[PDB]
Amino acid sequence: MLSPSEIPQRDWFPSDFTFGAATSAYQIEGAWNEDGKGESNWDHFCHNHPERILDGSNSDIGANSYHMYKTDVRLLKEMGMDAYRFSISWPRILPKGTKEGGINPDGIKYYRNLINLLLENGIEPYVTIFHWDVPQALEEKYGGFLDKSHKSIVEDYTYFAKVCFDNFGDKVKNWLTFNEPQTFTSFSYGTGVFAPGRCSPGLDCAYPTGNSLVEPYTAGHNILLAHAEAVDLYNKHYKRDDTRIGLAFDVMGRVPYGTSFLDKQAEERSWDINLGWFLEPVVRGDYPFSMRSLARERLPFFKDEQKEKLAGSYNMLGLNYYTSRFSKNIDISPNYSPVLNTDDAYASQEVNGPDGKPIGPPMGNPWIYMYPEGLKDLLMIMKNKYGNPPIYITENGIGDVDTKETPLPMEAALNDYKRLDYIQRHIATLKESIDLGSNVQGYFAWSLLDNFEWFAGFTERYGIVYVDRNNNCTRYMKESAKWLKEFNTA
């Protein structure tokens, strides 16, 4: 428990610093088939394979923010947030996913109203163009980001970005092309736990007929090409002195398992395959050496024209930080054979150190362990190794477990002191990091709202605002939310 002289204060951090909360379309919008919205990959996945989501639920309603957005802004204003990060639904804007299919007027209106309302209350909008919701039409036509032609998906995504620039560019000054490329590719086509549900034969997912060692890279390579085409388009027709564009990386901190230098090497291969995978190409135009040396031919190459577009394609970078892991070395030998794309790093990511203890206290769900130190390590790598570009912690928080056999009574849910302590500790390390020369610019608490947690369904509540599903999704502030309120209000 933090002492008083230790609780973050707003006068720490300059006036520029922005504080806000974040959400993602499919996770909170609901109205999956209303006002012309086209079906998405997740609509498709949840409806055809509820056994694949922990509690057999879907997000046909989610937090119902499509109809309750006005309330969301109200809560944001009341908390005194500076910004709000949300994503746009590709299929709600382009039902068929293509330029051919046409632009859905109702989709444009919804985001238009939200953006205007946000700005009216002094809340700066940070827009995530793509947050895993792929138009099923594009998925059936060519597998989406699996597009073997590496063209279709790029042209389509680009247009989708264009439409967004065309209708929201005048009000939006902060764009994020993609969210968590690594999580998306590794989970959708590696362990098949996400959206499509594909994985290598022998593995356990809905469609075990893919190749966990190849598809994640194929998809990731297309995303990168798409990113480039998009930023090139943004900089040539929409960029303004006061507007910025980038993308957000998912990343866990990596600490050497033991004292051996072999683990130090394992740690580096880990940062490389998790963060470097997508970060290095947007900064220098190619993948990390370790990956090219290990994944070999399974990692596509970029033409020279592509290398140019990629390198330096951002004005800011988003970082989604939740935990860390101990990286333990795995030697190269004729025995060991990678199974998942992530095993190409020749290192196991342990939760418990050699002393049998967890890297940090368990926050409740099956993977979040508190280790704010890891967020400092990350900010120092961005500063000393990667040009120290503007950083935004676009995601950070924990998920309070709430199941059938172990229901979370509302009163407990609102007294999320564990979440409060977590948020505060990380905010503090940013103040530390800034003084250490980090170029961090803002912090977004992940989940303004309790919502659909992908394959976890509604078994976890990540919001700072509670959402009562038993009474038409009416929201209530938790202590974390209340603390954030006085923090921005003091």
- Residue numbers in the known binding site are 27, 131, 179-180, 322, 395, 446, 453-454, 462
Residue 385 found at the interface with its own copies (CB under 8 A): yes
Tokens matching residue 7: 């609780």
Shortest distance, CB of residue 120 to ligand PSG, whole angstroms? Answer: 27
328 is written with which tokens?
């333990």
Residue 180 binds what, of its own copies, ligand PSG, none (CB under 5 to 8 Å, by partner type)?
ligand PSG
Cα 298 to chain centroid, rounded? 25
Contact between 443 and 427 (Cβ < 8 Å): yes
Answer for the pair 135, 25: CB distance below 8 angstroms, yes or no.
Answer: no
Query: Site for its own copies (CB under 8 A): which residue of 106, 286, 308, 432?
Result: 286
Assess 334 for contact with its own copies (CB under 8 A): yes
* 207 makes contact with its own copies (CB under 8 A): no
> CA–CA separation, 18 vs 221, rounded Å?
32
333 binds its own copies (CB under 8 A): yes
From the list its own copies, ligand PSG, none, partner contacted by residue 454 (C-beta under 5 to 8 A by kind): ligand PSG
Which of its own copies, ligand PSG, none is residue 395 near (CB under 5 to 8 Å by kind)? ligand PSG
State both tokens at 76: 């944001």
Nearest distance, CB of residue 386 and its own copies, angstroms: 8
Nearest alpha-carbon partner for 126 in 159, 173, 171: 173
- On the CB side of 338, CA atoms within 13 Å amount to 21
Q: How far is the CB of 382 from ligand PSG (least distance, A)?
A: 19
In the complex, the residues that contact ligand PSG under the rule CB under 6 A are: 24, 27, 180, 183, 250, 320, 367, 395, 399, 453-454, 456, 462
User: Is 155 known to be catalytic?
Assistant: no
In terms of C-beta density within 10 A (0-12 exposed, 13-18 middle, 19 or more buried), how is residue 357 classed?
exposed
Least distance between its own copies and beta carbon 344 (Å)? 10
- Alpha-carbon gap, residue 334 to 131, rounded angstroms: 39
- Binding-site residues for a beta-D-glucoside sit at 27, 131, 179-180, 322, 395, 446, 453-454, 462
Instruction: State the first-to-last Cα distance of the chain, in angstroms, to the nearest integer.
Output: 22
HSE (side-chain half, CA atoms, 13 Å) at 398:
29
> What does 24 bind: ligand PSG, its own copies, none (CB cut-off 5 to 8 Å by kind)?
ligand PSG
Residue 395 is a catalytic residue: yes
The interface mask with its own copies, positions 342-381, x = CB under 8 A, is: ----x-----------------------------------
| Pairing outcome for strands 400-401 and 460-461 | antiparallel
Which of its own copies, ligand PSG, none interacts with 270 (beta carbon under 5 to 8 A by kind)?
A: none
Pattern 233-272, its own copies, x by CB under 8 A: ----------------------------xx--x-------
Is there binding between residue 437 and its own copies (CB under 8 A)?
A: no
Distance (Å, rounded) from C-alpha 265 to C-alpha 441? 31
Residue owning tokens 């140019």: 308
| Stretch in the footprint of its own copies (CB under 8 A) among 14-22, 183-191, 327-335, 424-432 | 327-335
| CB contact at 8 A, 84 and 125 | yes
Q: How would DSSP label each residue in 30-57?
A: --TTSTTPPPBHHHHHHHH-GGGSTTS-
Q: Which residues are catalytic?
A: 180, 395
